[PDB]
C-alpha cells in the first residue's frame, strides 16, 4: 500500500518524501556505492542523502491513480493543490453532493476538488 520495502529501493524509483514543512514532495531514489544510503532527487531539484531506515520510515511510493474508481470517500490521499507549487498536501477523499476528479478534505483544513491526475495515493495510516 505505497509503503516502501527495502528490496524495491532501486535507482529511479519514484517516491514522495516529507520535508520539514509537513508537506510531501515528489522525488527519485538514487542508489550510491555504499549500501544502505541513498540520495533522493527532490523536486528546482535538490538532493538529500537518506539512510535506508529513514527512507523506510518516511518515504512512500509515488502512485498516480488512473481514475476515481478506487478513490471513494474516506480514501487517504495527497494532492497537488496548484500548478504553481510542487508540494503535495495530505488529506482524505470526502463525499460531495465524476470519474476524473474527487473532492478532498485536506489535513490543513482546506477542501477542494482535485483532478485524479493530481492525486497520489497514501498509506491509510500515514
Amino acid at each position: 500500500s505505497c509503503t516502501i520495502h527495502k528490496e524495491d529501493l532501486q535507482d529511479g524509483l519514484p517516491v514522495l518524501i516529507p520535508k520539514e514543512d509537513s508537506l510531501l514532495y515528489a522525488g527519485s531514489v538514487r542508489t550510491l556505492q555504499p549500501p544502505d544510503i541513498y540520495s533522493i532527487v527532490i523536486e528546482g531539484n535538490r538532493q538529500r542523502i537518506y539512510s535506508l531506515e529513514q527512507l523506510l520510515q518516511e518515504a512512500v511510493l509515488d502512485v498516480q491513480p488512473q481514475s476515481s474508481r478506487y478513490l471513494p470517500p474516506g480514501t487517504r490521499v495527497c494532492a497537488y493543490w496548484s500548478q504553481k507549487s510542487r508540494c503535495l498536501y495530505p488529506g482524505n477523499v470526502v463525499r460531495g453532493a465524476d470519474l476524473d476528479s474527487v473532492l478532498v478534505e485536506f489535513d490543513d483544513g482546506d477542501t477542494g476538488h482535485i483532478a485524479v491526475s493530481n492525486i497520489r495515493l497514501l498509506p491509510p495510516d500515514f
Binding site: 514543512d21 508537506l23 493543490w81 496548484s82 504553481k84 507549487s85 508540494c87 498536501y89 490543513d108 482546506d110 477542494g112
Partner: peptide, 6 residues
C-alpha cells in the same frame, strides 16, 4: 509556507 488561495 503560504498556500494558493481558492
Amino acid at each position: 509556507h503560504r498556500k494558493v488561495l481558492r
